[PDB]
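@channel anyone free to eyeball this complex?
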Amino acid sequence: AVGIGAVFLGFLGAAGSTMGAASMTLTVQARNLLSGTVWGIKQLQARVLAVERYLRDQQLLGIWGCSGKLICCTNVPWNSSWSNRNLSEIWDNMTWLQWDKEISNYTQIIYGLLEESQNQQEKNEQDLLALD
Amino acid sequence: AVGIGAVFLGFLGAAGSTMGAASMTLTVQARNLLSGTVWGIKQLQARVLAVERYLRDQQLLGIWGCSGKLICCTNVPWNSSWSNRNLSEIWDNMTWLQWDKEISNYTQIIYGLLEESQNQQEKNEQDLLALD
Amino acid sequence: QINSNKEYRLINCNTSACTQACPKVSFEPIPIHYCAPAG
Amino acid sequence: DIVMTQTPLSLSVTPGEPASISCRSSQSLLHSNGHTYVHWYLQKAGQSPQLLIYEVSNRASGVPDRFSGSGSGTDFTLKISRVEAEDVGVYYCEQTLQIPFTFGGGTKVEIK
Amino acid sequence: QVQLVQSGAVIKTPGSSVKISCRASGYNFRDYSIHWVRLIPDKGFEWIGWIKPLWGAVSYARQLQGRVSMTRQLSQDPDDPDWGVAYMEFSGLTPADTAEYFCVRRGSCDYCGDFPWQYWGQGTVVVV
Amino acid sequence: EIVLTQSPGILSLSPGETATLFCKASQGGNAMTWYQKRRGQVPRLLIYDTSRRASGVPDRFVGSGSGTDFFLTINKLDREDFAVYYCQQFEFFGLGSELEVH
Ligand SMILES: *[C@@H]1O[C@H](CO)[C@@H](O[C@@H]2O[C@H](CO)[C@@H](O[C@@H]3O[C@H](CO[C@H]4O[C@H](CO)[C@@H](O)[C@H](O)[C@@H]4O)[C@@H](O)[C@H](O[C@H]4O[C@H](CO)[C@@H](O)[C@H](O)[C@@H]4O)[C@@H]3O)[C@H](O)[C@H]2NC(C)=O)[C@H](O)[C@H]1NC(C)=O
Ligand SMILES: *[C@@H]1O[C@H](CO)[C@@H](O[C@@H]2O[C@H](CO)[C@@H](O)[C@H](O)[C@H]2NC(C)=O)[C@H](O)[C@H]1NC(C)=O
Ligand SMILES: *[C@@H]1O[C@H](CO)[C@@H](O)[C@H](O)[C@H]1NC(C)=O
Ligand SMILES: *[C@@H]1O[C@H](CO)[C@@H](O)[C@H](O)[C@H]1NC(C)=O
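replying in thread with the prediction:
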């Protein structure tokens, strides 16, 4: 029939698959990220650590150009000193966990580059809107 | 004069009115949704339940096309097996509490339909942007 | 033994006076499912 | 393997009386995406099986209210409300929740 | 489980006064009412009255007032707080009162009145 | 006072058949309870709130009806079910119908 349990995977379902098939379904890891007298305080400090580290990822996402769009292009070019890999491989050769080792030095340079490339784009949108 | 207390209602003000007059003022139920040694823990588990179930509604809203727009069209058609009602009535005949009984079986089918209709629209926006 | 006659004392009476266990509670093992929090 | 048992074996139903065919899985069939992945099929002898009820308590695009789906976790009932002459055939219960797809043993309904 | 153990059968004289224990065990005695039903031959069942054993507030039948009295005794120790005992002093007997006496209890059921009694006593027959 | 009247008196049947038991009240809009008492045993509960079942009662026991009429229908009679059956509303009991073998 229509609707089967084969290609409709679950949480962390495509965790070994290639990036071109992991970016097909990103919402399944997205929605299970917030919901799911001293052992009540083990409940409190487990809850306010979940809603805190969710908001922290929604803030670093927020101050770039991506409010809730969940996939978004940007303006910074890709300097080959970061990864030096071909484009035609890294969407069907590697997998995401193999990528996260391959780049982990160069984050906080990209995260610093993204904020300035947004705030430069933000006021330049205003200067276009101000003259007209 | 200008500015009267008649049509400027309060919290849950239009709760019996029709949908065409309840969607006139949706912000009044919106803004009173977050703000307003053991009975301090009755304060803590009342606060982190308020900010948690607010973020849960802001996440289900977020992964559809509606970041903070608070009224937004979408792309899924309205299958008449859900409601089978006329359009010309349900904005001036019924009221919202009468609607919530009339549809409550068919949620989590609509909420599942909305995520796939966004993520299909999300990557197709990228494939339009990638070729040019 | 506290050292005729023969009079003893409790062994934990030196250095640690300690509680009973209420016979309402029980020391049987029940299963415990450890769960990760959100995220 | 998960077991799909069908009750009863065969029913001789009168045209008009509500008929019920039940099938039970080995576990619950509710998935996190929002759909219950329990289905029901109609087969005539010498004819390929056709889907009747997908995503139960919702009708398909071409079947009337003569068929119905209801139940909960591990308990699934197919209800035939109004019996016609074309209602005869063998019905099958089948899960599309997990791999593999397991089918029912078959429930024959005949005419009197 | 819930168990209600009664007292044994007696042989009384017209003008005496019985006392019928009903020892409850297996549930928290400070929560659920205890009634008393008398079963007479050729008359069917007959109610007597309940006792809410938290404080001991009773209420009898209309035609048995002045002749029945129900007390209770709780369990005043934290090592075993579930058990307890209800009583019934049925005073001023008659040869027309020889019957079987049952102590009952409602069911932990929550869609369920006080009167649909689930667990029953073993039955005490009283001959006059 | 609410009075309860049981209809059939002695209802004699054979095992395997289906018996009905009709009990009539005198005040509408209430619940009903059905007590089964065997010969020389402690009575037990079957029905409360006119439709539900007690703990550990087979599903051949079913009761229905509202207003002033209340039925207790037993399908597929056993050999143990030949007992006296009692109605009960709030304190008042029926006099009890009897089930006998044929
Ligand atoms: C003392 O008085 C109180 C109220 O004054 C009575 O309480 C009501 O009793 C009735 C009947 O027992 C209850 O009605 C039952 O409700 C159940 C739950 O339904 C809920 O949801 C519906 C739909 O939203 C609401 O309309 C409803 O109010 C409930 O909130 C149903 O499951 C029941 O149906 C079952 O039983 C009937 C009759 O047996 C069958 O026909 C059905 O098919 C089904 O098997 C039933 O409808 C009612 O909920 C109770 N509460 C209230 C607040 O009204 C006491 O019964 C009464 N007690 C005595 C001893 O007299
Ligand atoms: C507390 O009391 C215990 C009980 O007597 C002492 O344990 C014994 O001490 C004597 C000392 O003369 C030893 O000969 C024994 O071998 C000890 N018994 C055991 C089982 O070891 C203990 O020394 C006391 N003091 C402390 C600090 O525990
Ligand atoms: C990251 O830097 C360390 C030293 O700074 C180096 O050893 C390591 O190889 C670098 N990672 C990659 C993937 O090159
Ligand atoms: C929702 O489903 C239940 C059974 O699944 C049904 O009884 C009820 O009528 C349905 N709700 C509506 C509004 O049709």
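from a first look: The first strand of chain D starts at residue 5 and ends at 7.
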